[PDB]
Amino acid sequence: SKPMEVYVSAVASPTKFWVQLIGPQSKKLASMVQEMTSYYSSAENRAKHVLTAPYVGQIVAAVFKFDEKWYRAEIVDIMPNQYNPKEQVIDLYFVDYGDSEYISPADICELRTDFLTLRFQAVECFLANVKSTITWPKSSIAKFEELTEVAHWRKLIARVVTYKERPRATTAVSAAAKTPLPGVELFDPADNSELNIADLMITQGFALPL
Template sequence: MNLDLSLRGKVILSVGVPATCLLLYWLLKNRDQDDEQDEEKEKVTTSRQTVIEVKVPSKAVGPLIGRQGANIKKLQEQTGTRICFQDDSKREPGKDRVLVIRGSTNQAQEAELLVRKTIREMPTVITEEIQVPIKALGRIIGRNGDSIRQMSRSSNARIFIDRAREEPRDITKKVSITGSQEQIEVAKSLIQEKVDEEEVFRAKAAVMAANREQRNKPNQGSVRRNDHTQTNTEKKTNDQDGISRNVVSMGTNVKEWPKQEYVEVYVSSVADPHHFWVQIISTNAIHLDELVHRMSSLYNTDHYKNMCDNEYRVGDYVAALYERDHSWYRAQVMGIEGRQLDLYFLDYGDSGYADINNVHQLRDDFLLLPFQAIQCCLGDIKVKGDEWSEDAVNVFEDITYTAKWKVLMAKRTGSKVTEDKEVIQIVKLIDTNSPVVRIAKCY
């Protein structure tokens, strides 16, 4: 084979090869430029935000946001978008709210689909009304509303108690529960537990009242007026046998008046309609009976029967024997006359005298329960003359079932403070035991 090229062929070859290389270089360069342009276009498209607005029913706003915005935050993290509600303070109540989604096209669309799915699958919010016994209302609400708030948190339902004016003969109260059907059922079961607890308490209280002895009417003048507060606030403790010697103000451990409009009470002692004592019917009433049982079991032992505490001072808290039922009760020493101690019974409000052999210093643990006797004054009445007649006091004791442990309704209308800084509750007493509601008044 002859490979020699003519002069013409060599010239053509020398010109053609560089042209081919030049063409190939140009094609490769254009392709790189096109790729760079495509990347730049993609960057421009990616950086451009898409804004999508979604109308959200007002009832779905809360669940969509979640507790402290947890649901919205999770949705933003999942889709890489920024989500918020429009500031529409002028929006009419109950109208839809506008949710704004910002992000890339794909991200915003994904977030929109998830939002609409969440709204679509959201359980229907309804409101159901139930009636609860008004006597269980305090237990349902709890101290400072603690119980009802806890039930709302546990069920994720909104519980609202009708605040309409309460009447003494009201039997039930309306409670509204808002949430899904499942949430409402959980809330109803929690409320029923409180109602059942109250029924158990009522049964125990009925047994307690039936077993209580009717306290003897004190001797004339033995129930004192406005002299149960000791001005000496010194406290001295004898650590021996866990016994405290207390000389303190009577107001330091007195049970507080509940906040509800009407409360159930026993009238435990009466001096006159402007000076009488009540016990509020609550779990503390049962705790008081349990305390009396514990004290009696202790102080009726031979150890204490053979012990005589000879050193007492005015203001000491003591345990005193009530000879009629052989039980021991909390009392305060108001005076000392030889071997006789003048006592004020802290949980009943009555007074009496006891031999020093029937009194012992009170242990610290017996002081933990607040004193149950609350001094009251009947409002809207005035005494005729200088003081109440014995007949008027007897009538008042009769219509208030004094120390007979029969329930009355009490409505607090105010309070007053004596010169000794003793707080007296001004109340209205209503007897709901008879067919006709009778307001306790003396004539």
């Protein structure tokens, strides 16, 4: 299949990360993040969308702690707050970026219907042709985060080259993730290396060939 321009938008490990496709859809995502952040920053707007009795699978609006902007999220689990049995802690999957965060319901709103138009932007991937030098070492995860420059808008070229079945669910997961996992080649067109990211990891001792 054909190569595509992507950002790596979240990382769990070299064999579990998320990409966003660059193009009309990424422009539209950026605009939506701006519009959602503008909209939900107002308490009057938030009151139009107050969250009541949330449920697993629900698509909501939520504040991302680390930039205080508003994002689309899927509720993947709900559990009692162990200080306030009165309250709940929510496990959120950010559908356009791929990362997960635990959050207070106070920081969640119902999603205004027209914000559901754009398809969910984060695509879960694994890096083809690699395996751990061991579970991945933290140093390997760090190296992969460094090479992809995750969350810093670095353009990479990705190509789907294989698929594998998703590993057994050990936790609560997203509705979509319960479809094979695409295995990709990643390369950085701006790094002066002919090696793609898998080959860089292997030849530098952060990974083994599969």
